[PDB]
Amino acid sequence: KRSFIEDLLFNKVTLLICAQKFKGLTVLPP
Amino acid sequence: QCVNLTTRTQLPPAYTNSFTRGVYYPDKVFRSSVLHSTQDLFLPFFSNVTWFHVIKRFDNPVLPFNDGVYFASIEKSNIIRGWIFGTTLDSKTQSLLIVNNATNVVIKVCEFQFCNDPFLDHKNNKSWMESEFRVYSSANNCTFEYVSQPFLMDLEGKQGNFKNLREFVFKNIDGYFKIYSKHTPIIVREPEDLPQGFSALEPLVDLPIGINITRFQTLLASSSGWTAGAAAYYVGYLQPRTFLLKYNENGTITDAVDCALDPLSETKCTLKSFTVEKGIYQTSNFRVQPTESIVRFPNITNLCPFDEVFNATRFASVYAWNRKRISNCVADYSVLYNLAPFFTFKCYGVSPTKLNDLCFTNVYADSFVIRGDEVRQIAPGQTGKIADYNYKLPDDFTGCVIAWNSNKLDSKVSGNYNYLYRLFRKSNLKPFERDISTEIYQAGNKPCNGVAGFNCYFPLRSYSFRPTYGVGHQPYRVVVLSFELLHAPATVCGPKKSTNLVKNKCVNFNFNGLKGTGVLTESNKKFLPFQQFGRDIADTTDAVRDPQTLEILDITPCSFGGVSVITPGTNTSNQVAVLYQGVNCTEVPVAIHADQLTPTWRVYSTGSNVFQTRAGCLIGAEYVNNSYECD
Amino acid sequence: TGKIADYNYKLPDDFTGCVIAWNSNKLDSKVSGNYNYLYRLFRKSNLKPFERDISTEIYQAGNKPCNGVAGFNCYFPLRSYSFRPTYGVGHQPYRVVVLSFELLHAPATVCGPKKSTNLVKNKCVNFNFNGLKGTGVLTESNKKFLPFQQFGRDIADTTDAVRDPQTLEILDITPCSFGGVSVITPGTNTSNQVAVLYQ
Amino acid sequence: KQLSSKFGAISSVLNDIFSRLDKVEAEVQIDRLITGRLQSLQTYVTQQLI
Amino acid sequence: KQLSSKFGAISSVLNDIFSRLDKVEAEVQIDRLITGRLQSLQTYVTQQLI
Amino acid sequence: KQLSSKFGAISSVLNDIFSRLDKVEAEVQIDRLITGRLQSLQTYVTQQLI
Numbered sequence A: 001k002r003s004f005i006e007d008l009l010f011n012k013v014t015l016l017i018c019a020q021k022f023k024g025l026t027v028l029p030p
Numbered sequence B: 001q002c003v004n005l006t007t008r009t010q011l012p013p014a015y016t017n018s019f020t021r022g023v024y025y026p027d028k029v030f031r032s033s034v035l036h037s038t039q040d041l042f043l044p045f046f047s048n049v050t051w052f053h054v055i056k057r058f059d060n061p062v063l064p065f066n067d068g069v070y071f072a073s074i075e076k077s078n079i080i081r082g083w084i085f086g087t088t089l090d091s092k093t094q095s096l097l098i099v100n101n102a103t104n105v106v107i108k109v110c111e112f113q114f115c116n117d118p119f120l121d122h123k124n125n126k127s128w129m130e131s132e133f134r135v136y137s138s139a140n141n142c143t144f145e146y147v148s149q150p151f152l153m154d155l156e157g158k159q160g161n162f163k164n165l166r167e168f169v170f171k172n173i174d175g176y177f178k179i180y181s182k183h184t185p186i187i188v189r190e191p192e193d194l195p196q197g198f199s200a201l202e203p204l205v206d207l208p209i210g211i212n213i214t215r216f217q218t219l220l221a222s223s224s225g226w227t228a229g230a231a232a233y234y235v236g237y238l239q240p241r242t243f244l245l246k247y248n249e250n251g252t253i254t255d256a257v258d259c260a261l262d263p264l265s266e267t268k269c270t271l272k273s274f275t276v277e278k279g280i281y282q283t284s285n286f287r288v289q290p291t292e293s294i295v296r297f298p299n300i301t302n303l304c305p306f307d308e309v310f311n312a313t314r315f316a317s318v319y320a321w322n323r324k325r326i327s328n329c330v331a332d333y334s335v336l337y338n339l340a341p342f343f344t345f346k347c348y349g350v351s352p353t354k355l356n357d358l359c360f361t362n363v364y365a366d367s368f369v370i371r372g373d374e375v376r377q378i379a380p381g382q383t384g385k386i387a388d389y390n391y392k393l394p395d396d397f398t399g400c401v402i403a404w405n406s407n408k409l410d411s412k413v414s415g416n417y418n419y420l421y422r423l424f425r426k427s428n429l430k431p432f433e434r435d436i437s438t439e440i441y442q443a444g445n446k447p448c449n450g451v452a453g454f455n456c457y458f459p460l461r462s463y464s465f466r467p468t469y470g471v472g473h474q475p476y477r478v479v480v481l482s483f484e485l486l487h488a489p490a491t492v493c494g495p496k497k498s499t500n501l502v503k504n505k506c507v508n509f510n511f512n513g514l515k516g517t518g519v520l521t522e523s524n525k526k527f528l529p530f531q532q533f534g535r536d537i538a539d540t541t542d543a544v545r546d547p548q549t550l551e552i553l554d555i556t557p558c559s560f561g562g563v564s565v566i567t568p569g570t571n572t573s574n575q576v577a578v579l580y581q582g583v584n585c586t587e588v589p590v591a592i593h594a595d596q597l598t599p600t601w602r603v604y605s606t607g608s609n610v611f612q613t614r615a616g617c618l619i620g621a622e623y624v625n626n627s628y629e630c631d
Numbered sequence C: 001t002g003k004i005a006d007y008n009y010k011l012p013d014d015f016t017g018c019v020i021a022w023n024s025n026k027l028d029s030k031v032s033g034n035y036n037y038l039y040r041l042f043r044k045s046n047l048k049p050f051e052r053d054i055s056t057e058i059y060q061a062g063n064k065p066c067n068g069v070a071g072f073n074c075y076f077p078l079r080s081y082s083f084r085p086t087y088g089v090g091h092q093p094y095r096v097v098v099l100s101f102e103l104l105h106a107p108a109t110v111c112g113p114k115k116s117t118n119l120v121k122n123k124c125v126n127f128n129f130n131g132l133k134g135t136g137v138l139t140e141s142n143k144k145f146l147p148f149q150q151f152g153r154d155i156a157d158t159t160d161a162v163r164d165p166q167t168l169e170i171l172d173i174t175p176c177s178f179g180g181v182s183v184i185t186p187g188t189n190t191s192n193q194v195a196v197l198y199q
Numbered sequence D, E, F: 001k002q003l004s005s006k007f008g009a010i011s012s013v014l015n016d017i018f019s020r021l022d023k024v025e026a027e028v029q030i031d032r033l034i035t036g037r038l039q040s041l042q043t044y045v046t047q048q049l050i
């Protein structure tokens, strides 16, 4: 349920190193 | 002496959980109104202790003793008297004897021969006699004795209304033996199975037996025909645990909470408080543990020629120090450790005691003979004649040096002129290099070759040795061992045996000294013939090549993750939920096993309905459909 | 590591004491050799620190059970020395004594000849209670100590209550008075007068 | 990437220190390493706060 | 409560170190202790600034 | 001005400690000095951030 501008906004911003993050470094979800 | 009793129809012992008994002051220090966290040998809360009942009835078999025991007797008429400690009880091993029957407490350590039935009960006809007190048949060599005051006793023999409750905890450690005790009166209860409540235990005595203890026996008080009254005792075992203890302003222990029983107790321990408000808390970290251990060393069975080096007939002079290579063999340094005096054995990069556990790639032995006054110049980065113009070690040298006195061999009464050394050198020499050229020192301003004279010197000088010389000038034999570690496939090292290989399981691998933990899998990369170990961005080895078989293994660490506790306020119910952060929820059923997980508690994994969220799976809460306001 | 440590007498790694050894070749050495000193040589496992064993059971080496007396693969777990004056240095008997002790967690039992002195209260003095060097003021205390306790600690794990070794009452230790100092001043040009505030 | 620094010890890998030295000497090396890593982690926390 | 930790030294009590050891190695342990306490104080100051 | 301190080492001047000490153990002292300087620089940077 998204508008048209929101699609471009989502696609224009981007978020294997997580595999090598074994050293007790995590990222909680919002 | 005792007489054979037998004629016993043994019945399996009873079981009963212990609510809160078995807490003692860990130190002789006063603390007031403060919560303190301790870690020591304790009795786990709500553990099932063994119940023995003796009334006709005769139940007192030998019981194991390990890591201390907790012994609690609920008794009235002083039926139980003493204790026996030992490992064989066969007059071949030292044994304890703690008897506090009527006069005093006697503590004897001796090679007793405890007979088949140690007791003081069966005497004519049904009233006790202090006979058979020599329950030990013999006493060969007794090494410790101690006598002190007795405890609170009682008269006659009764059956019922068992007021007195005596609690003891025994623990031996580092040779010492420690006993803590407590006495509680007016404990009357129609039901059995111990009272409910809290009570601390004070320290009583200490004593240094310094012997081996593995089992113990209880003692209580003609041979055929006897009627005994009611009696009951309980036995429990200790183990290492961490507790949180609360003192009061008067200085007495009032309450204590375990830190490995339940998630609620875990969060109480980590909050350093006895009440937690409603919310989500983060607790101890989940982590899986290793099952078996494996090792892997190269398949070589030959022996290194250390004897030839250390028993050589002739040693070369300093200016021509001899160098030998040791490779492709098994080096045992035990023979080097003990045989011969070896007045100096000093290593730099590695402790010699562990020298039998590493693996090298190239070993070089450099041998020579010097004077007794210059042996201190072998250290790296030194000064002096011998350490500058004849032989010098690099600053980062990694090996060992062994110097020993050989006055018998080299020294001669007539005079030993065979040993020569450079005395004059144009400039300091680089580490690990040799000089042999014989050129006359032209230390003057004239083009002199000559033979001898002013500024025209022969650089070489001859050591002279004879037994008449005092200590500090007799010849010393020096051998220096040099090697580099871990930088290449191993070629020569110690005799530790290999074992099998395990795949897809958490083991404690050991590949040529790389002690570590993880799971080993088969990789799909190609090594160079001169490469053995694979590193990564963090400079931690993760790819190895097995020495015996030419295969490439890849190492990954064990499974782990965070743990959170969902709880309403302690003022409300005590039911809690557990969340395993950031993990698929099918791994934790696999993790279900004892002696496998860092959190000892595992009842919750096989608990209530499991529901997978996007941040792990919640265990202990049901998923309703209708939506509310977030709490 | 070695035979004598692993089979006869091992010290804990955290040993807190002293060792004194000397040479006594003038006494124990015998012209015909001394065979009255024994030492273990065979054992089945390493022993925990400060452990003693006297049993002389028959040692079994091979898988075949051993009994009776000594023989092939069935050895006697003891051996003897050999002391005569003609051995070289490093083989004559050495006499060894080891002193072991624990530091300052119980009532004192033994220490040096340092003389005592009289007690002072409500005054900033440098006390010394069985090696507890410190400073402060000592007052009468009302807290109740169990008979086996001597020292009292606060939240910072530093002593604040002590028990006098000679007379068995309880003393409370509090630190000296202290604080900051501030200077109130006008400008340098206006005057040179100042005021002092003790915070 | 910052945990690849030796910080003054013989080696940056922790297991080799224990398997190549006696306990008494290894204390100093592991002390140095642990102090360095604690300092780095504290710096990261401060930057995150800002 | 921070100053109850040994920080790798032999004891958390400063007078015990001086009265049990000579003047040649006790300085190392008191140095460890002083570095630890200094670091803790600096961390407190930074938190107060934030 | 803070770089003039010795940080508990033999001397604040860097070059003199090499000659007066053997190279086997001067690395500890120079590492202590380098750690002190790094600490000072980090403190200054944090203050600048605030």
Ligand SMILES: *[C@@H]1O[C@H](CO)[C@@H](O[C@@H]2O[C@H](CO)[C@@H](O)[C@H](O)[C@H]2NC(C)=O)[C@H](O)[C@H]1NC(C)=O
Binding pocket: B299, B548, B549, B550
């Ligand atoms: C030492 O013994 C090991 C154990 O058998 C030998 O390892 C074998 O090596 C061959 C050749 O690579 C493999 O095909 C086998 O699978 C290996 N055995 C095992 C159990 O993995 C090794 O070859 C022996 N050393 C020598 C020099 O022969």
Ligand SMILES: *[C@@H]1O[C@H](CO)[C@@H](O[C@@H]2O[C@H](CO)[C@@H](O)[C@H](O)[C@H]2NC(C)=O)[C@H](O)[C@H]1NC(C)=O
Binding pocket: B427, B428, B429, B430
């Ligand atoms: C290796 O040998 C060369 C040749 O003898 C040395 O070079 C001489 O070094 C001296 C030292 O001051 C100079 O005065 C000469 O002029 C150099 N001669 C030449 C031809 O270069 C060199 O020093 C030697 N290496 C070492 C480490 O001593």
Ligand SMILES: *[C@@H]1O[C@H](CO)[C@@H](O[C@@H]2O[C@H](CO)[C@@H](O)[C@H](O)[C@H]2NC(C)=O)[C@H](O)[C@H]1NC(C)=O
Binding pocket: B087, B088, B212, B213, B214, C045, C046, C047, C048, C051
């Ligand atoms: C104390 O005695 C017990 C037995 O009395 C010893 O237990 C032995 O443990 C080893 C394990 O390596 C077993 O192989 C033996 O079979 C056990 N002995 C018996 C008789 O079964 C224990 O080792 C002794 N403690 C010490 C430090 O030696």
Ligand SMILES: *[C@@H]1O[C@H](CO)[C@@H](O[C@@H]2O[C@H](CO)[C@@H](O)[C@H](O)[C@H]2NC(C)=O)[C@H](O)[C@H]1NC(C)=O
Binding pocket: C165, C166, C167, C168
């Ligand atoms: C020597 O020390 C003992 C040990 O304290 C002293 O005994 C105390 O004496 C006082 C005075 O009579 C009593 O109040 C205490 O109760 C005693 N101590 C105990 C533990 O009971 C003794 O007085 C001292 N004597 C001298 C001459 O100093």
Ligand SMILES: *[C@@H]1O[C@H](CO)[C@@H](O)[C@H](O)[C@H]1NC(C)=O
Binding pocket: B002, B003, B004, B116
């Ligand atoms: C008791 O019986 C056992 C076995 O029947 C025997 O070994 C033991 O010697 C007996 N004791 C006495 C005192 O006769």
Ligand SMILES: *[C@@H]1O[C@H](CO)[C@@H](O)[C@H](O)[C@H]1NC(C)=O
Binding pocket: B015, B016, B017, B047, B048
């Ligand atoms: C452990 O305690 C429970 C609780 O009563 C009991 O049912 C169980 O039998 C005990 N364990 C054993 C091995 O008897």
Ligand SMILES: *[C@@H]1O[C@H](CO)[C@@H](O)[C@H](O)[C@H]1NC(C)=O
Binding pocket: B124, B222, B223
């Ligand atoms: C105990 O009394 C019974 C019956 O009088 C007798 O047979 C037995 O011998 C007595 N025992 C001893 C040790 O005297």
Ligand SMILES: *[C@@H]1O[C@H](CO)[C@@H](O)[C@H](O)[C@H]1NC(C)=O
Binding pocket: B306, B307, B310, B311, B335, B336, B339
């Ligand atoms: C050297 O020889 C002597 C006697 O020949 C022997 O006792 C000793 O063990 C030998 N040393 C080595 C290292 O083999």
Ligand SMILES: *[C@@H]1O[C@H](CO)[C@@H](O)[C@H](O)[C@H]1NC(C)=O
Binding pocket: B571
């Ligand atoms: C705890 O609950 C009781 C009754 O359930 C209530 O009277 C009391 O005020 C509550 N206390 C707190 C701190 O919520």
Ligand SMILES: *[C@@H]1O[C@H](CO)[C@@H](O)[C@H](O)[C@H]1NC(C)=O
Binding pocket: B583, B584, B585, B586, B612, B613, B616, B617
């Ligand atoms: C776990 O993995 C399976 C298979 O990949 C997947 O279907 C499931 O959604 C996963 N669950 C969680 C909680 O990650």
Ligand SMILES: *[C@@H]1O[C@H](CO)[C@@H](O)[C@H](O)[C@H]1NC(C)=O
Binding pocket: B623, B624, B625
């Ligand atoms: C929630 O809704 C689903 C779909 O209608 C249904 O299958 C499930 O039983 C419901 N659960 C509850 C607790 O009502």
Ligand SMILES: *[C@@H]1O[C@H](CO)[C@@H](O)[C@H](O)[C@H]1NC(C)=O
Binding pocket: C186, C187, C188, C189, C190
């Ligand atoms: C001296 O100091 C005062 C501050 O009280 C200032 O007002 C005055 O200008 C100063 N006079 C000088 C600097 O000559």
